[PDB]
Write a protein that binds this DNA or RNA. Sequence first.
DNA 1: TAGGGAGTAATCCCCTTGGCGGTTAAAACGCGGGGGACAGCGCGTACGTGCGTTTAAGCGGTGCTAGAGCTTGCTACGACCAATTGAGCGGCCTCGGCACCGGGATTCTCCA
Length: 56
Amino acid sequence: EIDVFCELSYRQRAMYQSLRNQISIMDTLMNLVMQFRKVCNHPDLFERADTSSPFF
DNA sequence: TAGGGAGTAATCCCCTTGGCGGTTAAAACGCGGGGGACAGCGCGTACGTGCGTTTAAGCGGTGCTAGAGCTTGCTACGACCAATTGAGCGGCCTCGGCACCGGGATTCTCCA
């Protein structure tokens, strides 16, 4: 059994920390631990990156 | 303090919608002609209008008594529930009613 640690990429931690900011109001925690598990898997699960352009 | 509710996502059965293909039967298209729609016409009779008659509907009034509408008293009966079972539902089976076919017989139409 080999443990393989890797840190949250800058996009993931932008998701994770703004999500964790909800703990300043709630604590829904069982909802948050599923959103935290999504971003810990891939942020496209939480918000799919897609072709984008400036504000019109 | 603990139990069971709230949240959520994976798991897997059920089932309704949609497409493909053919093919085949019914809808679409054409056209002749017929006969039924419909306009135009004549008559006559049947219905609206008017006037004098009558008839009885409607309003004001009197008297009566039935019976609608309310109060009281009580017990009968249907709501209620715990215990018992058998009537009636869901699943499975099969055979016989009925349909669908084919071909020969009787009916009905339409033109002569």
